[PDB]
Design an enzyme around this catalytic site. Structure first.
Site: not given
Ligand SMILES: CO[C@@]1(C(=O)Nc2cncc3ccccc23)CCOc2ccc(Cl)cc21
Ligand SMILES: CO[C@@]1(C(=O)Nc2cncc3ccccc23)CCOc2ccc(Cl)cc21
Ligand SMILES: [Cl-]
Lengths: 300, 305
Positions: B41, B143, B145
């Site tokens: 992603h 951040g 991920c």
């Molecule tokens: C890539 O971002 C997403 C996410 O979950 N990110 C995050 C992952 N960890 C902690 C997080 C804390 C606070 C905010 C976002 C976090 C949000 C948008 O929709 C999506 C949709 C799918 C996927 Cl696989 C990721 C995501």
């Protein structure tokens, strides 16, 4: 989102762990530059432990009595001296993995990560707080002496603890890296006991703010309290008194959540009076006191 | 003495964490040999996330669109491919700090350490379990991920998890290092929810053995139970069924403490039907389920790495 008890990454400290052997005793040492720091009780011959004269025992030792091992390499001890309860073994090789570091002495309520080691080898990392009674509730087996407590300041490791002893209740005592014990403890097998432990009140408040930041609001109430009335109630539940410095430290969390410190204090008073009623806060049924205000801000 | 939630020493994994930037998105990558692994992603914009065609998005990218940074050194991306939900960026330099490693897929109930990173920089390490609903109850901010889950076996790092997403309830979802999600999750901004979570029964039993090893015995009772009767009771409290494999894996702890597994099961049954009665076990008012039998043995015996 989410809230976990989180230790600092231990890599910078793992590169410093060595095995220190003297006679039949083996424990851990912290190899920083060309010096290995370890508990001075490594020179004790079990009998010595009750009333040791460490200056006298150390004078009788030579550099070749100390066997230092870093991985599968034996380090050459070229000097030895004592600073309070820590033994300093000068070695012929500077540790190439020495990080940017400093020795810091901490106060009760402060948290730190512990890298538990056996035979100079890292086995695990966990997060602890220095209890108000100056002990830590660690997880230490025989052979863990010399394991260290630390925090990380960006690129800098602040060493704040070295493990020396386990008390009869299963709690642990140790020193800063200058060899000064935290608490009224001595590195002697004489009868020793930790004082009655109390709850780190400022830390519980910090953790209640962490819970609000994470969406947990059930414990909030419309009450506020005076600092004096809060302390009168809290102390009857074995909670440390909250000082004006603690109120000030909680200011940023208070501004972030919109809940004044004395307002959150009235929630804490209610939780102490009623308990949880089958509810949890951040997945816990007990009030957590091993997250400082600085930990909560850093993690959230 | 003492019992703590303990993570594996993170040093071998810290030497592998890098920052991966693509467009306006920055996340973490795992640099092993000459390959950087990260969530696919990272190629998405806010619009793509709604309905992404990752193969189509990746074909439109060049190696110079990915900015990889290891400390203060920029790594040169010389190739890119996708394996399920993980992006593999081939780099011109092999990681000199690459430990002995393997990619493993764990089962629900298994525990692992998470090295939470931001901008390719490790910030914390914690221990968690893969919940029976395939989520992890982590601690992750935006951040994070690309942060990874791992275990250490002797001197070998087994990478078992990579962070991808946070669900609306605040729990987390991710994949193994081959890019396959744990659980019925997908990497798209679409309505998703974790199934109802259950308690990892074998882990609670392991932790009750840890409490007995530490001198906490108040919950022990004279009774035993059949595995069938235990499972009938446990499942009505949202507890996972206990299998004969779980009974066998608890064997060394049963021999060490002198408490047969079905004997400890009868203590667990009473703790469920009656509660703790104002008492705690290992300083906890709830039954802890994020210690496997192996974790308890390792901690109450000092295995080193
Ligand atoms: C890539 O971002 C997403 C996410 O979950 N990110 C995050 C992952 N960890 C902690 C997080 C804390 C606070 C905010 C976002 C976090 C949000 C948008 O929709 C999506 C949709 C799918 C996927 Cl696989 C990721 C995501
Ligand atoms: C020599 O070490 C002692 C000790 O506490 N060791 C330990 C430290 N940690 C965990 C322990 C787990 C189990 C067994 C001992 C442990 C034991 C004898 O009394 C003393 C007296 C003083 C000192 Cl500073 C140490 C010690
Ligand atoms: Cl298991």
């Amino acid at each position: 989102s989410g809230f976990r008890k989180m230790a600092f990454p231990s890599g910078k400290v793992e590169g410093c762990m060595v095995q220190v052997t003297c006679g039949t005793t083996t424990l851990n040492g912290l190899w920083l530059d060309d010096v290995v720091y370890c508990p001075r009780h490594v020179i004790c011959t079990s009998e010595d432990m009750l009333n040791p004269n460490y200056e006298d025992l150390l004078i009788r030792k030579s550099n070749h009595n100390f066997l230092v091992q870093a991985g599968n390499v034996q380090l050459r001890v070229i000097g030895h001296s004592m600073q309070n309860c820590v033994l300093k073994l000068k070695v012929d090789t500077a540790n190439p993995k020495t990080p940017k570091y400093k020795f810091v002495r901490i106060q009760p309520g402060q948290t730190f990560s512990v890298l538990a080691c056996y035979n100079g080898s890292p086995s695990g990392v966990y997060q602890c707080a220095m209890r108000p009674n100056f002990t830590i509730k660690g997880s230490f087996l025989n052979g863990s002496c010399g394991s260290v407590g630390f925090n990380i300041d960006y690129d800098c490791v602040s060493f704040c603890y070295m493990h020396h002893m386990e008390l009869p209740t299963g709690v642990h005592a140790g020193t800063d890296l200058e060899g000064n014990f935290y608490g009224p403890f001595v590195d002697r097998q004489t009868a020793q006991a930790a004082g009655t432990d109390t709850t780190i009140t400022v830390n519980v408040l910090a953790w209640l703010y962490a819970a609000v930041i994470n969406g947990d609001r059930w414990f909030l109430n419309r009450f506020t309290t005076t600092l004096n009335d809060f302390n009168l109630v809290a102390m009857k539940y074995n909670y440390e008194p909250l000082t004006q410095d603690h109120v000030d430290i909680l200011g940023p969390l208070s501004a972030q959540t919109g809940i004044a410190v004395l307002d959150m204090c009235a929630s804490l008073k209610e939780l102490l009076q009623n308990g949880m009623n089958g509810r949890t806060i951040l997945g816990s049924a007990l009030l957590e006191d091993e997250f400082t205000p600085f930990d909560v801000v850093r993690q959230c």
